[PDB]
Ligand binder design. Structure first.
Ligand SMILES: CO[C@@]1(CN2CCN3CCOC[C@@H]3C2)/C(F)=C/C[C@H](C)[C@@H](C)S(=O)(=O)NC(=O)c2ccc3c(c2)N(C[C@@H]2CCO[C@H]21)C[C@@]1(CCCc2cc(Cl)ccc21)CO3
Ligand SMILES: OC[C@H]1O[C@H](O[C@H]2[C@H](O)[C@@H](O)[C@@H](O)O[C@@H]2CO)[C@H](O)[C@@H](O)[C@@H]1O
Length: 518
């Protein structure tokens, strides 16, 4: 459970230029005598936060920037402190992608956007609209071909169509995300996902098509079109297909809006090799020579390094990548992105398979995407009003009727539990001996052990939160009132992470209000 000193272990996704990255490793070894091991484990973006939490895992993790804010919030990433001269070598917007709470938490590498990739021997002119693809598939089926195949197992690839007519993740306005405002189950998201489920119903696409199936069908010339990123171009070059890379089709006359990723390199907070990792990333990888070694293996897209991006900018495939990037949006890096992606992944798979309707599927995705913020609103307000004797005057905001009725229910059932179990609550309080901000952060491991060692039901959830309020009254008492909000975030995190699937099957806090209805 300790990262070894005097080497570098690196994790990067299996679709990226990991052999190219290993050659940059070898150059580092030649100068320093330090061995660089590059690994591409399956589901590395799920494995990282698990292994890093115990002070294990790689020295360096590569992913798109969207996952890095959760990593940072959980204390898993070393702060990045490049000097000016090095910061000035990368585009300022790429540094913005790896800024979390005013601190740089990664090195940006490259800008990725999806494009439409078409076979010019099947489709001299690619379609400008999604709406013309059914008619084009009918023409191509008559010659033993299909119009379009892309990965339907990862919401990344379907999001551009969902977003086109007004689906969104977290509303962005006046240079600010409203994390309360989620656009997964609106009329625009519904129209985009209904169009996708209609293509599958009409046998223009297959619900089971994944990355490998779509890639093989395009690269063998069986399908005229795919949707993929720059990393995919190497294998198409090898297939000798006469391909173009172009703007994604419009939907209802509006651009497809890809979620734009910055491939980023983070340093593990538990690494004893932080100076070696900084030296490797700044003076070996993020050079014209280091990025070229990776790019030549699998293309990176529009690199963060200004000197190299100027050389690659002339490539029409890159110009097309940035066209689809500027019609799209830079992904948020807020901790909730992980939950957003899980929720939308399940909705797309379930709608495509017929397991749920589009309305049922996006309903559950909206509930899943809102769950952390709504749970924190309820739990934070209950802890603080129990501590101080006075309620919060601030509007509840989005889904406010549910937050209000959940807080009302919690006051009734929670107060009942605190009273009937006052002796048991006092006994556990003294036994924990909670004195400061440090002791509060150690409760997280105890909460997970006890709250997860039992049945899932609303009764045990009321106990988690009610004991939370009991501790909050104590923290007010000992002039540790500034610990109540951190405590509320820790309780919320334990609840939503461990009971995510059960909470969504109950329709979240509406199920809570219903279950305890008098
Ligand atoms: C008897 O005393 C407890 C139970 N415990 C169980 C674990 N064993 C382990 C060995 O030591 C002794 C202890 C005793 C009590 F009163 C139970 C009455 C309830 C009503 C039940 C009938 S129930 O079924 O409905 N629910 C629960 O069993 C329950 C659900 C969530 C909780 C917890 C229980 N517990 C343990 C309860 C709290 C009071 O006494 C415990 C609290 C918690 C952990 C501490 C740290 C902590 C910190 C914060 Cl801020 C919030 C929650 C927690 C996590 O949440
Ligand atoms: O599908 C949800 C998924 O989307 C993004 O992951 C992309 C990644 O950004 C690309 O570099 C490429 O590897 O394909 C991945 C999709 O399979 C998000 O970055 C990721 O967090 C999210 O789970």
């Amino acid at each position: 459970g300790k990262i070894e000193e005097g080497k570098l272990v690196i994790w990067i996704n299996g679709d990226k230029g990991y052999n190219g990255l290993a050659e940059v490793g070898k150059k580092f070894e030649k100068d320093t005598g330090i061995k660089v091991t590059v690994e591409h484990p399956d589901k590395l973006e799920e494995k990282f936060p698990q292994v890093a939490a115990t002070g294990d895992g790689p020295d360096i993790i590569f992913w798109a920037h969207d996952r890095f804010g959760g990593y940072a919030q959980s204390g898993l990433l070393a702060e990045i402190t490049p000097d000016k001269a090095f910061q000035d070598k990368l585009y300022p917007f790429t540094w913005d992608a790896v800024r979390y709470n005013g601190k740089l938490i990664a090195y940006p590498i490259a800008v990725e956007a999806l494009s439409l990739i078409y076979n010019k021997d099947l489709l001299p002119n690619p379609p400008k609209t999604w709406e013309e693809i059914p008619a084009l598939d009918k023409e191509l089926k008559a010659k033993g071909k299909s119009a379009l195949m892309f990965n339907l197992q990862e919401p990344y690839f379907t999001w551009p169509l969902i977003a086109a007519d007004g689906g969104y993740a977290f509303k962005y306005e006046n240079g600010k995300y409203d994390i309360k405002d989620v656009g997964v189950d609106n009329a625009g998201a519904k129209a985009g996902l209904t169009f996708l489920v209609d293509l599958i119903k009409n046998k223009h696409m297959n619900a089971d098509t994944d990355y490998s199936i779509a890639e093989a069908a395009f690269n063998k010339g069986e399908t005229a079109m795919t949707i993929n990123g720059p990393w995919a171009w190497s294998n198409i070059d090898t297939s000798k297909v006469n391909y173009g890379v172009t703007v994604l089709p419009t939907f209802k006359g509006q651009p497809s809006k890809p979620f734009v990723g910055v491939l980023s390199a983070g340093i593990n907070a538990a690494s004893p090799n932080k100076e070696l990792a900084k030296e490797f990333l700044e003076n070996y990888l993020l050079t014209d020579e280091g990025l070229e070694a990776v790019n030549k293996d699998k293309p990176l897209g529009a690199v963060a390094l200004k000197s190299y991006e100027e050389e690659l900018a002339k490539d029409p495939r890159i110009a097309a990548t940035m066209e689809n990037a500027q019609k799209g949006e830079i992904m948020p890096n807020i901790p909730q992105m992980s939950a957003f992606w899980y929720a939308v992944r399940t909705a797309v798979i379930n709608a495509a398979s017929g397991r749920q309707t589009v309305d049922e599927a996006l309903k559950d995705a909206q509930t899943g995407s809102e769950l952390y913020r709504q749970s924190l609103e309820i739990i934070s307000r209950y802890l603080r009003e129990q501590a101080t004797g006075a309620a919060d005057t601030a509007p509840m905001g989005a889904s406010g009727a549910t937050s209000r009725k959940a807080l009302e229910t919690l006051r009734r059932v929670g107060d009942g539990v605190q009273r009937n179990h006052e002796t048991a609550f006092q006994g556990m309080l003294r036994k924990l001996d909670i004195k400061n901000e440090d002791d509060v952060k150690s409760l997280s491991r105890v909460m997970i052990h006890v709250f997860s060692d039992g049945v899932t039901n609303w009764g045990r959830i009321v106990t988690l939160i009610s004991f939370g309020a009991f501790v909050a009254k104590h923290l007010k008492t000992i002039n540790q009132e500034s610990c109540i909000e951190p405590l509320a975030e820790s309780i919320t995190d334990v609840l939503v992470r461990t009971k995510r699937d059960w909470l969504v099957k109950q329709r979240g806090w509406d199920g809570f209000v219903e279950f305890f209805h008098v």
